[PDB]
Amino acid sequence: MEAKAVARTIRIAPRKVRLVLDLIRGKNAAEAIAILKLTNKASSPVIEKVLMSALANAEHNYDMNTDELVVKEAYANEGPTLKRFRPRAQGRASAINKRTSHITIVVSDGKE
Amino acid sequence: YRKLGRTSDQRKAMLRDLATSLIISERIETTEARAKEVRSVVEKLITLGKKGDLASRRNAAKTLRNVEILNEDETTQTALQKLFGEIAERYTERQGGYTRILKQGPRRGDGAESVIIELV
Amino acid sequence: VKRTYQPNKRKHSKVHGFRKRMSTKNGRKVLARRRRKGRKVLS
Amino acid sequence: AVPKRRTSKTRKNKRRTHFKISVPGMTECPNCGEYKLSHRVCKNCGSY
RNA sequence: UUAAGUUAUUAAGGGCGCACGGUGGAUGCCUUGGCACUAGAAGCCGAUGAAGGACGUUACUAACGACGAUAUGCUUUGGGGA
RNA sequence: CCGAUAGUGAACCAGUACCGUGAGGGAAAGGUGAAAAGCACCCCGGAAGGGGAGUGAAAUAGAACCUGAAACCGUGUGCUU
RNA sequence: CAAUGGUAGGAGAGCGUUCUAAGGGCGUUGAAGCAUGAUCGUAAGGACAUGUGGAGCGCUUAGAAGUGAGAAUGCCGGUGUGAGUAGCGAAAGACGGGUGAGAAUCCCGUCCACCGAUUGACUAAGGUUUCCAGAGGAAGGCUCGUCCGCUCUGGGUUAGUC
RNA sequence: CGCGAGCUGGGUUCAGAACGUCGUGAGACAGUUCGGUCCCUAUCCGUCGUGGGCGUAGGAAAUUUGAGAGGAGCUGUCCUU
RNA sequence: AUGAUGAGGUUAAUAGGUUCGAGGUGGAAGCAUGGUGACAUGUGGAGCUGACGAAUACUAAUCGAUCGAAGACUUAAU
Ligand SMILES: CC[C@H]1OC(=O)[C@H](C)[C@@H](OC(=O)NCCCOCCC#Cc2ccc3c(=O)c(C(=O)O)cn(C)c3c2)[C@H](C)[C@@H](O[C@@H]2O[C@H](C)C[C@H](N(C)C)[C@H]2O)[C@](C)(OC)C[C@@H](C)C(=O)[C@H](C)[C@H]2NC(=O)O[C@@]21C
Ligand SMILES: [Mg+2]
């Protein structure tokens, strides 16, 4: 029915990963893969791999064959942020938040 | 024409170097803008080669870099000689073209549309 | 610009350093406080 | 030259309504059936 | 059909409710460690080299204890018990 | 009397990170489970991760590990514009 | 039958939090916390049910207090907004081949360019292992990274005359 | 005494110095004189341009009237009569 | 600025190249003659010529994909 695949503490700020996931929401598996592999953004390779894992999970665990799969829902939410600093002018230091992302994708057969 | 995000001396140099390298390899990979701008330079050099008179040889020597190609059987000859002995004959009957361009997908480090400019 | 602390091992160990603090009673004091405090670098 | 007040969540989400990435210009490749970008060479096959 | 009049639909996005996630480390429970005392010891250590250190020491090896070239310990007298 | 923003500055290799030329100043940081039983194998991936299977009473107890609030960030939508 | 706006302020009655004494109770057949709900009292507030939770905690009377926070440009810790904005720290790169999961960014080659009283060679002060050869890619490199002054392993400094 | 998050900074109003005057003195004078650091990446309203969505009871391509709105709006000399 | 606007996508002159020309510059190269040399003369208004005008599919706009109507009531005339 539903296959799950998650990538955690990915090193991409969640605002940036969500821009690519706003395309594969609700599309077919083949079309979704073609989008990711052709969208020229940074997060795209890391998501094409979370999708891949879900689909493999589906086949190997549920016999859910990949020709009928649709990204039921796919989202991304914040992760354990890493705090750093940049030496700025006049002795002052400003902060730099290197963020992360918890990418989730679930693909469904639409059935029960 | 285009400026390629670069000065005049650095562009003159880049265009002629890219034209030479194309002549060496007969197909190269680069970004669209520079392919679109080397197209004319390489096409004009081949024209200087379709005549072969000493004037055109001397005049095409301005652009090409001085490079040496090792052909099969350890035979050696320079870019001018290639242009005027192996490429003039190939396009003696064609009245234009001389080059094609095949767009490719964006590269990784940038969003630059890489292309392959090849001698047709 | 020439900033402060142009390092120099000899002067560092001359103006400071164990034997210099052991040369004056007040020098003997700072070692006393630093041991009471349990410091690891005494001079 | 400093924000006189906060930009509420409403205003924030409102401004970024038009801030989105477009689906790629992809078409199916005639030799292999895999998707490719239009006017580019298929990277899976290598055709036209 | 034509005139006049009236009224949906829309949601790029937003709001409000609700559901489910994340982030974060409040709260509750907990104690290794502290705080204030009481009663009794004890209230001098050094040229016999002190107090405090530095280097070392293990089968292998950095740190912490312990130890000192007899070094991750030796002897002896007693206690004990795999 | 205090229960981890408290109680020592220090429950944890703390007068230590660290800062200062130096006197000196001076932190932050406890909690898996009863038992480590600390996840044999398989699947995607270069790996990090994950998803099954298994351990366990429990694995949204999987080592950043008890409970897990709010700010904040998302994904759906019933009613609205 | 009369009275009941109220600030500085006076008076009175109370609700709550921790602990203690005693009495009486509840608890893996699920305590405290946490979340939700359309419940009760005049208020401070009190219950009940359902979920998570995996061991303590209520009630009556009375005692004691580190007892109630929304403001102190308060302290500590988290997370916002500005915003996918400013910035990416003086400069010339191009292309072929190779390596890899991945390459404008790593290795080799050709061409081109910059310095050249120096961006070259030595040697002091200072720093101490940054030195060398393999290997790795979390983190650090203002991007990427197969690379490195980064990480792991093993090595490397030889004087009668300096 | 419009306008410095649009500009200058000559005057004036910091610290230096000097002359005249006052004060025993330190110093003083709206008395002169030479010199003297002008920071800010625009959130909102406002304004100048430029897109997308939706509505105009079907979906469209072109030509349009004009409810309104804005811009202009100055004037000399010579000759003739 | 970007997006818009406009000219075009093979049943094609939209851009590049090729050919011819306008305009600009001013006598290319190699020869032969003359000079000891520095140079000069003829070839030959030659040679070169970014955006400007025209012709030509030689090269690239090849393949394909997405969005987009079926027309409400009420009343009056018809
Ligand atoms: C570079 C960035 C920094 O900006 C600045 O320096 C700017 C330039 C400065 O502009 C001005 O000078 N006025 C505009 C120029 C006015 O000319 C008239 C002739 C005069 C004079 C005068 C009089 C007395 C004294 C004095 O007595 C004395 C001493 O030593 O005692 C020292 N001198 C120099 C005096 C000189 C800011 C903006 C200044 O504010 C302004 O001052 C005034 C008090 C009031 C102004 N308003 C309220 C009317 C105000 O707007 C401050 C004070 O700066 C010194 C800003 C404060 C906040 C700072 O400290 C920041 C952090 C700066 N510090 C720094 O590093 O970044 C800065 C931003
Ligand atoms: Mg500095």
Separation CA B69–CA B81 (nearest Å): 10
What is the Å distance from ligand 2's center to A98 Cα? 24
Helix (H, G, I), strand (E, B) or coil at A52: helix
Query: Is there a contact between A28 and A1 (Cβ–Cβ < 8 Å)?
Result: no
Separation CA D39–CA B32 (nearest Å): 13
Residue (of B60, B55, B64) closest to B15 by Cα position? B64
A63 Rama sector, left if φ>0, alpha if ψ -120 to 50, beta otherwise: left
User: How far is the CA of C31 from the CAs of A17, C9, C15, C28, in angstroms?
Assistant: 58, 21, 15, 5
Nucleotide nearest to A89 (CA to C1'): G89
Residue (of B11, B119, B10, B13) closest to B65 by Cα position? B13
- Annotated resolution, angstroms: 2.6
Domain ranges of chain D: 2-48
Amino acid at C41: V
The DSSP element (H or E) to which B49 belongs, if any, is: helix B32-51
Residue (of A38, A32, A78) closest to A52 by Cα position? A32
Helix (H, G, I), strand (E, B) or coil at D44: coil
Separation CA B111–CA D21 (nearest Å): 14
Query: Is there a contact between B19 and B64 (Cβ–Cβ < 8 Å)?
Result: yes
Chain F bases under 7 Å from protein CB? 9, 14-17, 20-26, 42-45, 47-52, 64, 72-76
Which bound ligand lies closest to the C-alpha atom of A90? 2
3-state secondary structure string across B5-47: CCCHHHHHHHHHHHHHHHHHHCEEEEEHHHHHHHHHHHHHHHH
CATH architecture for residues A2-110: Alpha-Beta Complex (3.90)
Exposure string of A58-97, with b = 16+ CB inside 10 Å and e = fewer, is: beeeeebebeebbbbebebeebeeeeeeeeeeeeeeeeee
| φ and ψ at residue C10, rounded to 5 degrees | -65, -50
For A85, the token pair is: 């600093």
CATH architecture for residues C1-43: Orthogonal Bundle (1.10)
DSSP assigned state of A110: S
Helix (H, G, I), strand (E, B) or coil at A17: helix
| Residues in chain B closer than 8 A to D43 (CB atoms) | 104-105
Helix (H, G, I), strand (E, B) or coil at B67: coil
How do the residues of chain A divide into helix, strand and coil, expressed in percent and rounded to 5?
A: 35, 35, 30
User: How far is the CA of B113 from the CAs of A40, A95, B106, B110, D10, in angstroms?
Assistant: 10, 35, 4, 9, 38
Query: Is there a contact between D36 and D26 (Cβ–Cβ < 8 Å)?
Result: yes
Chain G bases under 7 Å from protein CB? 79-84, 89, 92-96, 102-105, 110-113, 125-127, 138-144
The DSSP element (H or E) to which B118 belongs, if any, is: strand B113-119
Q: Looking at CA atoms only, how far is residue A112 from chain D in angstroms?
A: 30
Helix (H, G, I), strand (E, B) or coil at A109: coil
Q: Which residue of A has its CA nearest to D44?
A: A37
For D17, the token pair is: 């309504």
Domain ranges of chain A: 2-110
Q: Cβ contacts of residue C30 below 8 Å, gap of 6+?
A: C21, C43
- List subunits contacting chain C, requiring 3 or more Cβ pairs under 8 Å: none
A95 Rama sector, left if φ>0, alpha if ψ -120 to 50, beta otherwise: beta
CA B107, B109, B111: angle at the middle one, nearest 5?
A: 50
Separation CA B103–CA B38 (nearest Å): 15
Long-range contacts of D39-43 (CB under 8 A, 24+ apart): D39/B103, D40/B103, D40/B104, D40/B105, D41/B102, D41/B103, D41/B104, D41/B116, D43/B104, D43/B105
B98 Rama sector, left if φ>0, alpha if ψ -120 to 50, beta otherwise: left
What is the Å distance from ligand 1's center to A90 Cα? 17
Which of D15, D29, D34, D35 would best serve as a mutation to test chain A binding (most A beta carbons within 10 A)? D35
Round and report the angstrom distance from CA (B44) to C1' (I25).
21
Q: Radius of gyration over alpha carbons of chain B, in Å?
A: 15
For D1, the token pair is: 């030259």
| Residues in chain D closer than 8 A to A22 (CB atoms) | 20-21
What is the Å distance from ligand 1's center to D4 Cα? 23
DSSP assigned state of B83: I
Query: Is there a contact between D27 and D35 (Cβ–Cβ < 8 Å)?
Result: yes
Residue (of B14, B31, B15) closest to B103 by Cα position? B31
Query: Is there a contact between B98 and B43 (Cβ–Cβ < 8 Å)?
Result: yes
Kindly list the structural domains of chain B, giving each domain's residue range(s) and its CATH number in brackets, ordered by start: 1-120 (3.90.1030.10)
Cβ pair B104:D40 closer than 8 A: yes
Separation CA B117–CA B32 (nearest Å): 9
Separation CA B48–CA B56 (nearest Å): 5
Separation CA A87–CA A96 (nearest Å): 10
Q: Is the CB of D9 under 7 A from strand F?
A: yes
Domain ranges of chain C: 1-43
Q: Cβ contacts of residue A74 below 8 Å, gap of 6+?
A: A21, A24, A25, A51, A103, A104, A105, A106
Separation CA A98–CA A83 (nearest Å): 6
Chain I bases under 7 Å from protein CB? 16-19, 28-30, 47-51, 56, 58-65
Q: Is the CB of D31 under 7 A from strand H?
A: no
